[PDB]
């Protein structure tokens, strides 16, 4: 998928 | 519903007409470069009126508004004898287009305030309204800073919505 | 194929 | 002389690869898709790309780029005919050819690319015989793969004995916008559906002009076959001597002969189109469709595609007979008529708006291109005369035929 | 003075664009495609700056999503990468666990965040809570 | 009319671009038919879908008037999508966008401070050079206000109307008087942006704007000493976006002043030492500190510390910091010149590094670094590098060798040696603009020409398919062929030159298919010059010029015929017009 | 993962090792380096299954270059499976043996290949014939040391003609590789044997035993007639690679026939409808068919002179066929169909494929140069394109008007009076040079050439090489024609071309004109305002030393590129 991963993880 | 333009030259009082028919007062108005729109609701017909200013950098862009237009209001000035030549030139440059061909015309002899200002007949035979073809042209002398004749012109124009 | 055929002869020598 | 038959897809990942010589590296396929994107984004596209000293012959199917590299002075006609025969073999096993068949049938597609080609030289590609030792469900290979008759496994038995023909015309046309006809040629394709018992020897006999002239009947109705391209099955030496078409047929559907003749008679369907394109305002289409052909035959489902501008809007369609749908996916008004008899004249008047602010790029002028289909009606006048079933066993078979005219690229250039 | 911004994803497709200079719409499609082609053809220890044609072109990948800028050649360079980071913090504090999808679908609001942060080229709100408060109060106006 | 989420969810289901076009146009025609009904209800989502169709790269030219109808609306959602469509679909030159002028002028005096945010943002992002002459009187009224959300937008919109109309900044000078006193930082930051633009454009504003040096000095020191805040805090470093802009304003001030340079000395000396340098943010602040210190007539003890900062930046593994240090050293090449050359091995080592940007900045810094003392040694490194570039760095390096060697060459012999070296090894990467300057310098050279023409002739007997090489060589033969072949009016003992292979190599140049046909024009010019320069074998090149008179190139067909007239009619007036060309700077 | 795969691959039940090797060649499909599992799948090779041996042989075929020393653990299994009574498994073993390119292996594999070249069932012989060429590809002298060329040339002396087709294919593959020592051609009786084996092999074999005949050349007339009369009925085959190869051998063999007899005309009336009907094929084969028609109408133009109509493009051809049909339309344009070509090129310059539009206008140019009867019609067509005001069409049509006025300089003075009013904002420096030349050469019927060149004189120092040099020629030509109204113009262009101009060819031409004009301006009318001799056109008919060999390569990469077969292979 590679899209559902959030960007900067807070 | 009836889509309306108010094209014409600069200093013709067209924004004064547009805020006298909608609101009802003579609001102090800048020379409007772009356009205005106020849904006049008169003779139970919502006259959408696309007031378009008439400075020299805008007059090419009137062709963007000539589509689904069910009738013009070509406001001329009665106090500009020097500009009725280019008023005729604009009115004969504009009414001969294929877009906006079924559009009735309602010419206003606006700014009746001086003996320099003309009546309907001299503006008619300087603009040359008797040389039009397929036109429901109808000059109507209006006074924008008193409201005199405007609602009568819209009354005529509301007669000519349906056939 | 919705259409219909036509028989052609066999020998025709 | 192929080197490595690949199967790409629309992104550049290899669904299946199978090298035959090892004279091209296997990681040369990763250099394909950037070269195709580079050559297409400057308009110098060609089927033969070039990565240094490795040439990429390729065809483009639905999702697939069947790239087949080579390195030497490769025989390009051989490579491209092999690529379309790979397409035909896959589409005769797998009833569509997409990515969803190559990633599911790697059991059989590696066996097929093992079988079809050896070292770059295609050797067994008739699919109806290839269904007998390469299956998705192995014995000895048949004697059909050996013998001279290499398209017909012996011992086929049916209860009935039916030979279905299809003398399917295809009128081409390209009418220039002045009103005259430029290229009006007819590409027929006698497309059989054979169901016989044994190893028969058919002798198809047309009304060929050279046969009627060598016989002495050169004053009756005779079609003038300019060029005839037969299947493999037709023995061509006997055709070249005295115009006799003798062939041992396969089992199933195939294209027997593909003739092509010109025609200096009027077009069948004629499309007189006008355009009232006012700039910035609107456009009108007073297009009339007069059916020049005979009064007896009925043009089933014509679809006169008519190219509208790209950004037209809010349409109106006053026709006489037949529905109009405006298809904006293609920017055309597909004026459909279901039953279009010969001799009539049905008139249509489209009417669009047009955006007042002008476009940014020019668009081009595609042709009006009809999609007609007139059954029981051969334009060129070809008449099948007989079909001599000859079998050592000896039986009465039932030949059949039907006649269809279609469109080829029945285009008409516009204003 | 940031010339433009190009949120484009990993496969090459463009998810956002905001041109603070007015070059014609053929040059937008040629500049955008050649810059997506330069940045996606670059390795990962490659200093996050490209001297692209009098524009010190910045990029800082965050996911499959890339980012991009073009700072003019007299300004600071690291702070433009930090502007990219503050814009990702705004896209996160508005959404809440910002994604690739929620920039695809809510791009109408992605421009409104970018227009509550960068107008005309420069930064307007150096804080990060006044910006999200202003956009959530302009959306609480509904 | 489907929503935008439904549209983008459909476009994600499209596989081929040739089918994604079908799914765009399928809905784009429904948008076009929903614009001719003059909808007021569903026009928000139609312009939102049309902006999405624009962003994918499609025609969206028609939905500009239906943005202008959204802008003059009364709802806020319609205005919001309308100003987004105005900022995306319109520019300076779309020419329908003069119609936004009255709409923005009516929405700058709107009651809501969120509609005026849109009307300032659109005018800032895409106002043109004629909108601003009708809008600057109403932007500066929004600049005199007391509302902080409009001060920061009016300052940047004033930046835009000064950038597009640069003869208009004089009516913001009585606007920015005494507004460095804002409690807010966003207003403070955008007013510093306005001061940066006002000081960048015209030095008639500097003497008024270097009076407010100590005010923002106190502002920056109170930014540094207020070490913590909930907002503005990036990584524990207090308000970087304001510190960088204040340091940039201090860079563009005092760059030729002495009083303000001693005024801004204190906070620069403090921020050069007392900043956290761990994260990216402190490198940003301190890099701007270094660029501030380098350009002002500073303290002598500052720049020692600044060179020490750059020495700390050059050695980091973080490639961002190397790009920063190389850009900083590229900035201060001339200013504090002798402190830069002591990082020479560090700069040269970056040419071996595996980045595009690092090699390019090390290249440009090396080309700027060469003075008249390291010229002999560093050129061997550069001419190894010219051998060892990418195919995109050979051009810039090959131009830089010529630009460097014209400046600070120790000799004229070695200078032609390295130029000839580059032309023999670069070839198809040196620009064709180099040839007039190369020919200009070798004809400025008045003393060494046989050493030139022999090496040119020995270098083009090898190859011809490198175009600027034969470009230089043909002119060198044509104007100095009296020293190539010496005294050989008839045959002598065999010397390397033979006055027939000299003409046969030009004959091979003319008929080779690897020529741009300006090398061919050089070649015919050299052939006709070799009727006067050679007395040995003439009336044989006459055959070549006569048979080249019916070639298909237009200028060559002129040139051969207009020479053949002189070879057939005016044989004593041929030499009367082939004197050497004069020499210029 | 792969270890559990090896655990399933070292099992005793067949239905786990079978799924193991299917999983292995599915991992090979998706692009995994499964090369480390090589000597553990080869234990699962000697199986009773045949649907499984194909997969293991496939794995051996892909992964022997990368595991070359490991690959010596299959040779006994190849020579073990080359004895089995099933012919399919023998031919599978034989076509696997050749594909493994490992130099430790092919030394061992000549013995079962020698066994199989004389084997009975002709499926394994038609495999082993091509496997001989597979063996000669790897190690050359090992084959002749084993002596397979004699066993290969005896397969041609056998019946069952698919064997003959594969043997001739591999024999041509061998004979191409040698330095032509012991050339492998034969007598005409073997050619009678192949030509009677041509009407019986497959649709693919008829290509290979017509690539054999592209090397032979006969020595008589009746001999060449007897082999052309049996290759000629291959012109009625649907497979568009058989037709083009028969055209290859017919175009080779018609260099030997007699023009006086009736077989030359009968042959060229049988060779035009197949070359026309190749264009009713699929659009990747139209590219090869059109480059070979481009290479035939340069050699024998007697064939396709009557067919212009089938070379008119459609709209929905791709760009690589629309580019080549314009080239064929150039090659066939004569006095009979100037009107169809010009009315067809005027409808092609209304496209948006800019490569194709520029090619159509240059085709108007080459068609105007080719026929002198219709250049009036061509210049009227070009002016009717220029009066539409589309920028790239005008920037090509000005170049074409230049390339006509240099060729036909006599009576086209009533055209430039339209061309003096062309709105000189024209931008591309290929067209600015053409306009400056047309102004300069014809500066008598342009009665105000003096006022329009001044707009070209504002930015003289930075335009290009060509526009500056053409201005220097044209203004000097104008001053030499009329010295009255351009006296200060030639002085200002000399002080702009010799003082502040650094271009050395510009300085050379400037000082030559300055010294010519200050020396003897009356002689200059004989010097530069000369009658220029008649222009030898760029003959794009390829050299018939090369073209005689490119006929032998028709339907290969040597004819699509129009190159010899040595300047592009490596
Ligand atoms: N005496 C008199 N003056 C008028 C009248 N209408 C307009 N004016 C004057 O004309 C000037 C221009 O009127 P506006 O309507 O405000 O501007 P405009 O005519 O719309 O000019 P544009 O917007 O560019 O078309 C105003 O300053 C008024 O003083 C009128 O009815 N009577
Ligand atoms: Mg007004």
Question: D168 is written with which tokens?
Answer: 């399917």
Q: Which ligand is nearest to the CA of B13?
A: 1
Sequence-ordered alpha helix ranges (H) in F272-374: 280-295, 300-314, 319-331, 344-349, 356-369
Name every chain F residue with its beta carbon within 8 A of the beta carbon of G533. 549-550, 561
What is the C-alpha to C-alpha distance for residues D282 and D353, in angstroms, rounded to an integer? 4
Rounded to whole angstroms, the Cα distance separating F301 from F304 reads 5
Burial of G526 (0-12, 13-18, 19+ CB in 10 A): middle
Chains within contact range of chain G (3+ C-beta pairs < 8 Å): D, F
Residue pair B155/B148 in contact (Cβ under 8 Å)? The answer is no
Residue with tokens 């070209």: G456
Interface of D with G in 210-249 (CB under 8 A): 226-232, 234-237, 239-240
Contact yes or no for D222/D208 (Cβ under 8 A): yes
Strand D316-318 and strand D345-353: pairing?
A: antiparallel
- Please state, as a whole number, how many other Cβ atoms lie within 10 Å of the Cβ of residue F320: 21
Q: Which residue has the tokens 């529905």?
A: D323
Instruction: Report the alpha-carbon distance of residue F474 to residue F459 in Å, rounded.
Output: 12
By C-alpha distance, which of G336, G250, G343 is closest to G299?
G250
Asked whether the beta carbons of D171 and D408 are under 8 A apart, the reply is: yes
How far is the C-alpha of G383 from the C-alpha of G398, rounded, in Å? 9
- Residue corresponding to tokens 């020698």: G114
B97 touches chain D (CB under 8 A): yes
Which residue(s) pair with D227 in the sheet? D260
Nearest CA in chain E to F78: E142
Q: How many CA atoms lie within 13 A of E27 on its CB side?
A: 6
- Cβ atoms of F62 and D311 within 8 Å: the answer is yes
Give the 3-state DSSP-derived string for chain D, with helices as H, strands as E and coil as C.
Answer: CCCEEEECCCCCCCCEEEECCCCCCHHHHHHHHHHHHHHHCCCCCCCEEEECCEEEECCECCCCECCEEECCCCCHHHHHHHHHHHHHHHHHHCCCCCHHHHCCCHHHHHHHHHHHEECCEECCCCHHHHCCCCCCCCCCCCCCCCCCCCCCCCCCCCCCCEEECCEECCEEEEECCCCCECCCEECCEEEEEEECCCCCCEEEECCEHHHHHHHCCCCCCCECCCEEEECCCECHHHHHHHCCEEECCCCEEEEEEEEEEECCCCCCEEEECCCCCECCCEEEEEEEEEECCCCCCEEEEEEEEEECCCCCCCCEEECCCCCEEEECCCCEEEEEEEEEECCCEEEEEEEEECCCCCCCCCCCCCCEECCCEEECCCCCCCCCCEECCCCCCCCCCEEEECEEECEEEEEECCC
> Do the chains contact at E63 and A3, CB–CB below 8 Å?
yes
Task: Please state the φ and ψ torsions of residue D287, each to the nearest 5 degrees.
Answer: -90, 130
Virtual CA dihedral for E36, E40, E44, E49, nearest 10 degrees? -20
Sheet strands side by side (includes D68-70):
D16-19, D4-7, D68-70, D54-57, D48-51
3-class SS of residue B37: strand
Number of CB atoms found within 10 A of residue G233's CB = 20
| Whole-angstrom distance, CA of residue G342 vs CA of residue G380 | 10
Q: How many residues does chain C have?
A: 13
How many domains does chain G fold into? Answer: 1
Q: Any bridge partners for residue E122, and if so which?
A: E119
Asked if residue B97 lies in contact with residue D277, where contact means CB atoms within 8 angstroms, the answer is no
Q: Which residues of chain F does D361 touch, with a Cβ-Cβ cutoff of 8 Å? A: 59
Cβ atoms B105, B70 nearer than 8 A: no
Q: Say whether domain D1-121 belongs to CATH 3.30.450.60.
A: yes
- Tell the residue number behind the tokens 């049509």, with chain if given: G397
B95 to chain F, minimum CA–CA distance in Å?
A: 21
Domain count, chain F: 1
Distance separating alpha carbons of residues G244 and D79, to the nearest angstrom: 13
CA atoms in the 13 A half-sphere facing the CB of G561? 20
Please list the residues that pair with D253 across neighbouring strands: D193
Domain extent, residue B76, equals 1-163
Using CA atoms, how far residue G73 sits from G47, G55, G139, G250, in Å, is 15, 17, 20, 50
> Are G481 and G490 contacting, i.e. CB atoms less than 8 angstroms apart?
no
CB B16 within 8 A of CB B26: yes
Q: At F187, list the tokens.
A: 């207003």
CB contact under 8 A, D121 and G352: no
- Identify the CA nearest to E88 among candidates E71, E77, E78, E100: E100
Is the alpha carbon torsion for G103, G108, G112, G116 positive or negative?
positive
**Experimentally determined by:** cryo-EM
Closest CA to G350 of D414, D312, D354: D414
Residues 6+ apart with CB under 8 A from E82: F234, F240, F241, F280, F281, F284
Evaluate whether D412 touches D173 at the Cβ level (below 8 Å): yes
Give the helix, strand, coil percentages of chain B, each rounded to 5.
Answer: 30, 20, 50
Which residue has 């980045």 as its token pair? F355
In Å, what resolution does this model reach? 3.7
* 3-state per-residue secondary structure call for F205-244: CHHHHCCCHHHHHHHHHHHHHCCCCCCCEECCEECHHHHH
Q: How far apart are CA F412 and CA F406, in angstroms?
A: 10
Closest ligand to B20 CA?
1
Distance from CA of D114 to the nearest CA of G (A): 8
Q: DSSP alpha helices (H): ranges in F13-62?
A: 17-36, 43-55
CATH number for the domain harbouring residue B67: 3.40.50.300
CATH at residue G65: 1.25.10.10
Alpha helices of G236-353 — where are they, by DSSP H? Answer: 240-253, 263-268, 272-277, 285-296, 319-331, 338-345
Quote the tokens at residue B18: 């547009």
C-alpha to C-alpha distance for D270 and D116, rounded to whole angstroms: 46
Got the DSSP string for G381-417? HHHHHHTT--HHHHHHHHHHHHHHHTTS-SS-TTTHH
Structural element, H or E, at residue B50? strand B45-52
| Dihedrals phi, psi of F326, to nearest 5 degrees | -65, -40
Task: Collect all residues with Cβ–Cβ distance below 8 Å to G355 and sequence separation of at least 6.
Answer: D43, D44, G319, G323
d(CA D318, CA F462): 77
Q: Which residues pair with D193 in a beta bridge?
A: D164, D253
Reduce the DSSP state of residue G160 to 3 states and report it: coil
Residue written as token pair 């050395």: G504
F331 part of contact set with chain E, CB < 8 Å: no
Q: Read off the DSSP letter of residue G533.
A: P
Q: Which of B132, B136, B85 is nearest to B106 (CA)?
A: B136
Tokens 């060459």 correspond to what residue? F409
Smallest Cβ–Cβ distance between A8 and the set E10, E62, E100 belongs to: E62
Q: Helix (H) and strand (E) counts for chain F?
A: 30, 2
Q: Is the alpha carbon torsion for G85, G86, G89, G92 positive or negative?
A: positive
Of F122, F241, F197, give the one whose Cα is nearest residue E119.
F122
Q: For residue B37, give the chain F residue with the closest CA.
A: F72
Distance in angstroms (rounded) separating the CA atoms of residues D189 and D274: 34
CB contact under 8 A, F555 and G507: no
Q: Both tokens of residue D2?
A: 């192929």
Give F174-179 contacts, CB < 8 A, sequence gap 24+.
F175/F140, F175/F143, F175/F144, F176/F143, F179/F151
Find the helix packing angle between F356-369 and F375-387, rounded to 10°: 150
Could you give the CA distance from residue F512 to residue F76 in angstroms, rounded to a whole number?
Answer: 71
Q: What CATH number has the domain bearing residue F375?
A: 1.25.10.10
List F233's β-bridge partners, or say none.
F238
Q: Please state, in angstroms and as integers, the Cα–Cα distance from residue G316 to each residue in B153, D409, G319, G321, following that order.
A: 57, 9, 9, 10
The domains of chain D are located at 1-121, 149-415
| Cα gap G71→E26, rounded to integer Å | 57
Preceding-residue numbers of gaps in chain D (C–N over 2.5 Å)? 137
Alpha carbon separation from G423 to G385, G447, G464, G466 (Å, rounded): 15, 17, 20, 20
Residues F359, F364, F369, F372, Cα dihedral to 10°: 110
Q: Give the span between the Cα atoms of E16 and E123, in whole angstroms.
A: 18
Beta-strand relationship, D117-118 and D68-70? unpaired
Q: Which residue of G has its CA nearest to D46?
A: G320
Does F16 sit within 8 Å of D10, measured CB to CB? yes
Q: Is F65 on the interface with B (CB under 8 A)?
A: yes
G431-434 contact pairs (CB < 8 A, 24+)? G431/G394, G431/G395, G431/G396, G431/G398, G431/G399, G432/G456, G432/G463, G432/G464, G432/G466, G432/G467, G432/G470, G433/F554, G433/F555, G433/G402, G433/G466, G433/G467, G433/G470, G434/F554, G434/G398, G434/G399, G434/G401, G434/G402
d(C-alpha D55, C-alpha D68), whole Å: 9
* Listed residue (D272, D270, D200, D259) closest to D230, CA to CA: D259
In angstroms, rounded to a whole number, what is the distance separating the alpha carbons of residues G263 and G524? 62
Domain count, chain B: 1
Q: For each of the domains in chain E, give its residue range(s) and CATH number, in order of start.
A: 1-142 (3.30.450.60)
Can you tell me which atom of ligand 1 is nearest the CA of B12? 19
Beta bridge partners of G188: none
Three-class SS of F128-145: CCCCHHHHHHHHCCCCCC
- For helices F519-529 and F467-484, angle between their N-to-C axes, nearest 10 degrees: 10
Report the half-sphere exposure of D391 (CA within 13 A, side-chain side).
19
Report the residue count for chain D: 415
Inter-residue contact G520 to G277 (CB < 8 Å): no
**Which pair of structure tokens corresponds to residue D265?**
């008679």
Going by the annotation, the residues of the binding site of B for GTP are 8-16, 110-113, 144
In the DSSP assignment, the letter for residue F203 is: T
């Amino acid at each position: 998928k590679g899209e559902n991963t959030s960007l900067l993880h807070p | 519903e009836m889509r309306i333009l108010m094209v014409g030259l600069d200093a013709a009082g067209k924004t004064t007409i547009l805020y006298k028919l909608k609101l009802g007062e003579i609001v102090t108005t800048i020379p409007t470069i772009g356009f205005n729109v106020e849904t006049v609701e008169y003779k139970n017909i919502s006259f959408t009126v696309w007031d378009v200013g008439g400075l020299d950098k805008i007059r090419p862009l009137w062709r963007h508004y000539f589509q689904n237009t069910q009738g013009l209001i070509f406001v001329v000035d009665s106090n500009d004898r020097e500009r009725v030549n280019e008023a005729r030139e604009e009115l004969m440059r504009m009414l001969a287009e294929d877009e906006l061909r079924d559009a009735v015309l309602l010419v206003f002899a606006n700014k009746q305030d001086l003996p320099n200002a003309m009546n309907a007949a001299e503006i008619t035979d300087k603009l040359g309204l008797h040389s039009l073809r397929h036109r429901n042209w109808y000059i109507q002398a209006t006074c924008a800073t008193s409201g005199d004749g405007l609602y009568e012109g819209l009354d005529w124009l509301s007669n000519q919505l349906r056939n | 194929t919705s259409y219909d055929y036509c028989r052609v002869p066999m020998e025709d020598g | 002389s192929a080197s490595a038959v690949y199967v790409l897809d629309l992104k550049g990942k290899v669904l299946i690869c199978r090298n035959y010589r090892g004279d091209v590296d296997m990681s040369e396929v990763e250099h394909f898709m950037p070269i195709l994107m580079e050559k297409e984004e400057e308009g110098m596209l060609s089927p033969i790309l070039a990565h240094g000293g490795v040439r990429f012959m390729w065809i483009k199917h639905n999702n697939l780029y069947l790239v087949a590299t080579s390195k030497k002075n490769a025989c390009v006609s051989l490579v491209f005919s092999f690529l379309y025969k790979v397409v035909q073999v896959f589409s005769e096993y797998f009833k569509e050819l997409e990515e969803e068949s190559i990633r599911d049938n790697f059991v059989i597609i590696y066996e097929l690319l093992d079988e079809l080609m050896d070292f770059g030289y295609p050797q067994t590609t008739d699919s109806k015989i290839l269904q007998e030792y390469i299956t998705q469900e192995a014995p000895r290979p048949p004697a059909t793969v050996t013998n001279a008759v290499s398209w017909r496994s012996e011992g086929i038995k049916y209860r009935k004995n039916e030979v279905f023909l299809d003398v399917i015309e295809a009128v081409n046309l390209l009418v220039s916008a002045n009103g005259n006809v430029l290229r009006s040629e007819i590409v027929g394709s006698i497309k059989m559906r054979v169901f016989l018992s044994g190893m028969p020897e058919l002798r198809l006999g047309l009304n060929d002009k050279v046969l009627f002239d060598n016989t002495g009947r050169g004053k009756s109705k005779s079609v003038e076959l300019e060029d005839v391209k037969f299947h493999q099955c037709v023995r061509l030496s006997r055709f070249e001597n005295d115009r006799t078409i003798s062939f041992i047929p396969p089992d199933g559907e195939f294209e027997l002969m593909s003739y092509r003749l010109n025609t200096h008679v009027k077009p069948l369907i004629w499309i007189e189109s006008v355009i009232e394109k006012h700039s910035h305002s609107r456009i009108e289409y007073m297009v009339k469709a007069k059916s020049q052909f005979k009064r007896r035959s009925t043009a089933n489902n014509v679809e006169i595609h008519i190219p509208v501008p790209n950004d037209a809007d809010s349409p109106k369609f006053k026709t006489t007979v037949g529905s109009v749908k405006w298809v904006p996916e293609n920017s055309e008004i597909v004026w459909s008529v279901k039953s279009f008899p010969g001799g009539k004249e049905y008139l249509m008047r489209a009417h669009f708006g047009l955006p007042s602010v002008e476009a940014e790029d020019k668009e081009g002028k595609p042709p009006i291109s009809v999609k007609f289909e007139i059954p029981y009606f051969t334009t060129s006048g070809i008449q099948v005369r007989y079909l001599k079933i000859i079998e050592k066993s000896g039986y009465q078979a039932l030949p059949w035929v039907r006649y269809i005219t279609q469109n080829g690229d029945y285009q008409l250039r516009t204003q | 003075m940031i010339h433009f911004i190009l949120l484009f994803s990993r496969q090459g497709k463009l998810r956002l664009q905001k041109w603070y200079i007015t070059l014609p719409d053929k040059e937008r499609k040629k500049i955008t495609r050649e810059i997506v082609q330069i940045i996606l053809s670059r390795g990962h220890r490659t200093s996050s700056f490209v001297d692209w044609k009098e524009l010190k072109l910045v990029y800082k990948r965050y996911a499959s999503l890339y980012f991009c800028c073009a700072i003019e050649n007299q300004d600071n360079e690291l702070l433009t990468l930090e502007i990219v980071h503050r814009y990702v913090e705004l896209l996160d504090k508005y959404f809440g666990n910002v994604c690739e999808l929620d920039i695809i679908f809510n791009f109408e609001k992605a421009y409104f965040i970018l227009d509550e942060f960068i107008i005309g080229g420069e930064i307007q709100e150096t804080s990060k809570k006044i910006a999200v408060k202003a956009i959530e109060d302009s959306d609480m106006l509904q | 009319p489907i929503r935008l989420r439904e549209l983008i969810r459909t476009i994600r289901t499209a596989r081929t671009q040739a089918e994604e076009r079908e799914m765009i146009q399928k809905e784009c025609a429904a948008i076009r038919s929903s614009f001719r009904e003059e909808d007021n209800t569903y026009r928000c989502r139609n312009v939102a879908k049309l902006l999405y169709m624009h962003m994918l790269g499609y025609p969206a030219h028609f939905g500009q008037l239906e943005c202008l109808k959204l802008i003059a609306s009364q709802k806020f959602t319609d205005k919001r999508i309308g100003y987004l469509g105005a900022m995306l679909l319109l520019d300076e030159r779309q020419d329908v966008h003069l119609l936004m002028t009255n709409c923005i002028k009516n929405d700058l005096n709107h009651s809501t401070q969120f509609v005026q945010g849109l009307a300032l943002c659109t005018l800032g992002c895409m106002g043109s050079s004629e909108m601003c002459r009708d809008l600057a009187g109403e932007v500066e009224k929004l600049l005199k206000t007391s509302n902080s959300y409009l001060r920061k937008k009016a300052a940047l919109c004033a930046v835009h109307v000064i950038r597009k109309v640069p003869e208009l900044m004089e009516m913001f000078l009585p606007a920015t008087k005494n507004l460095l006193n804002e409690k807010n930082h966003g207003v403070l930051h955008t007013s510093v942006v306005l001061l940066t633009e006002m000081c960048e454009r015209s030095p008639d504003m500097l003497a008024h704007f270097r009076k407010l040096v100590p005010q923002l000095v106190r502002i920056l020191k109170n930014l540094i000493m207020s070490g913590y805040s909930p907002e503005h805090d990036v990584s524990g470093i207090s308000d970087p976006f304001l510190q960088v802009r204040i340091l940039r304003l201090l860079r563009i001030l005092g760059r030729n002043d002495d009083d303000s340079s001693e005024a801004m000395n204190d906070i620069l000396a403090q921020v050069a030492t007392n900043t956290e340098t761990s994260k990216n943010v402190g490198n940003a602040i301190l890099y701007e500190t270094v660029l501030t210190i380098m350009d002002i007539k500073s303290e002598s003890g500052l720049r020692v510390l600044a060179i020490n900062i750059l020495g700390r930046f050059l050695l980091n593994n973080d490639k961002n910091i190397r790009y920063v240090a190389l850009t900083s050293l590229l900035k201060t090449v001339q200013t504090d010149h002798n402190a830069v050359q002591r990082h020479r091995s560090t700069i040269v080592d970056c040419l071996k590094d595996l980045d595009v940007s690092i090699k390019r900045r090390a290249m440009e810094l090396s080309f700027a670094l060469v003075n008249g003392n390291n010229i002999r040694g560093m050129m061997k490194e550069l001419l190894y590098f010219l051998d060892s570039c990418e195919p995109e760095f050979k051009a810039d390096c090959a131009s830089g060798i010529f630009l460097a060697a014209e400046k600070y060459a120790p000799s004229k012999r070695w200078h032609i040696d390295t130029i000839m070296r580059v032309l023999t090894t670069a070839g198809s990467y040196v620009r064709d603009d180099a040839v007039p300057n190369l020919i200009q310098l070798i004809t400025n050279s008045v003393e060494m020409h046989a050493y030139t023409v022999q090496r040119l002739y020995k270098a083009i007997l090898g190859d011809y398919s490198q175009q600027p090489l034969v470009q230089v060589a043909a002119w060198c033969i044509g104007e100095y062929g009296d020293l190539l072949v010496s005294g050989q009016c008839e045959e002598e003992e065999p010397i390397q030159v033979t006055e027939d292979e000299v003409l046969d190599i030009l004959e091979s140049v003319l008929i080779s298919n690897m020529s741009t046909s300006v090398t061919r024009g050089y070649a015919l010019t050299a052939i006709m010059k070799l009727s006067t320069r050679f007395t040995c074998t003439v009336n044989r090149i006459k055959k070549v010029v006569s048979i080249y008179g019916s070639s298909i190139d237009v200028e060559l067909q002129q040139r051969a015929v207009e020479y053949n007239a002189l070879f057939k009619k005016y044989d004593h007036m041929r030499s009367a017009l082939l004197e050497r060309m004069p020499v210029m700077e | 993962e792969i270890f559990e795969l090896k655990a399933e691959l070292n099992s005793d039940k067949k239905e786990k090792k079978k799924e193991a090797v299917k999983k292995v060649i599915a991992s090979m499909t998706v692009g995994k380096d499964v090369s480390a599992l090589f000597p553990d799948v080869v234990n699962c090779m000697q199986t009773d299954n045949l649907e499984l041996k194909k997969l293991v042989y496939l794995y051996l075929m892909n992964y022997a270059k990368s595991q070359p020393d490991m690959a010596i653990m299959a040779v006994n299994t190849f020579v073990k499976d080359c004895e089995d009574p099933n012919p399919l498994i023998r031919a599978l073993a034989v076509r696997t043996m050749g594909c493994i390119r490992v130099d430790k292996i092919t030394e061992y594999l000549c013995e079962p290949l020698r066994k199989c070249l004389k084997d009975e069932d002709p499926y394994v012989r038609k495999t082993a014939a091509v496997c001989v060429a597979k063996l000669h590809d790897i190690n050359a002298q090992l084959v002749e040391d084993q002596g397979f060329l004699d066993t290969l040339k005896d397969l041609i002396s056998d019946s069952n003609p698919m064997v003959v087709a594969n043997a001739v294919a591999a024999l041509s593959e061998i004979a191409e590789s040698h330095p032509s020592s012991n050339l492998l051609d034969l007598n005409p009786q073997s050619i009678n044997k192949l030509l009677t084996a041509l009407n019986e092999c497959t649709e693919w074999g008829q290509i290979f035993i017509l690539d054999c005949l592209a090397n032979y050349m006969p020595k008589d007339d009746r001999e060449a007639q007897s082999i052309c009369e049996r290759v000629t009925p291959r012109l009625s085959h649907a497979n568009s690679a058989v037709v083009l190869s028969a055209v290859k051998v017919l175009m080779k063999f018609m260099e030997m026939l007699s023009k006086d007899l009736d077989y030359y005309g009968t042959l060229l009336k049988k060779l035009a409808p197949p070359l026309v009907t190749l264009l009713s094929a699929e659009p990747e084969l139209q590219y090869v068919a059109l480059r070979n028609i481009n290479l035939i109408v340069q050699k024998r133009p007697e064939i396709l002179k009557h067919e212009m109509k089938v070379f008119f493009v459609k709209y929905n051809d791709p760009i690589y066929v629309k580019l080549e049909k314009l080239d064929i339309m150039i090659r066939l344009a004569s006095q009979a169909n100037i009107a169809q070509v010009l009315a067809e090129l005027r409808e092609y310059a209304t496209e948006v494929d800019v490569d194709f539009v520029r090619k159509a206008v240059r085709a108007i140019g080459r068609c105007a140069i080719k026929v002198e009867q219709s250049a009036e019609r061509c210049v009227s067509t070009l002016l009717d394109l220029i009066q539409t005001k589309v920028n790239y069409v005008v920037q090509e049509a000005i170049v074409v008007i230049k390339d006509i006025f240099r060729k036909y300089p006599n009576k086209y003075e009533s055209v430039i009076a339209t061309l003096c009013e062309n709105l000189d904002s024209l931008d591309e420096p290929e067209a600015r040079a053409a306009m400056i030349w047309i102004v300069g050469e014809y500066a008598e019927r342009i009665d105000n050439a003096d006022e329009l060149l001044e707009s070209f004189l504002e930015g003289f120092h930075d335009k290009s090489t060509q526009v500056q040099l053409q201005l220097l020629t044209a203004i000097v030509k104008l001053f030499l024609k009329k010295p009255t109204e351009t006296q200060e113009l030639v002085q200002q262009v000399l002080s702009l071309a010799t003082q502040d101009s650094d271009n050395p060819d510009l300085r050379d031409r400037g000082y030559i004109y300055w010294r010519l004009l200050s020396t003897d301006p009356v002689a200059a009318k004989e010097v530069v305002l000369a009658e220029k001799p008649l222009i030898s056109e760029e003959t794009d008919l390829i050299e018939p030393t090369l073209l005689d060999e490119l006929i032998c390569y028709i339907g290969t990469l040597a004819s699509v590129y129009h190159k010899p077969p040595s300047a592009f292979v490596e």
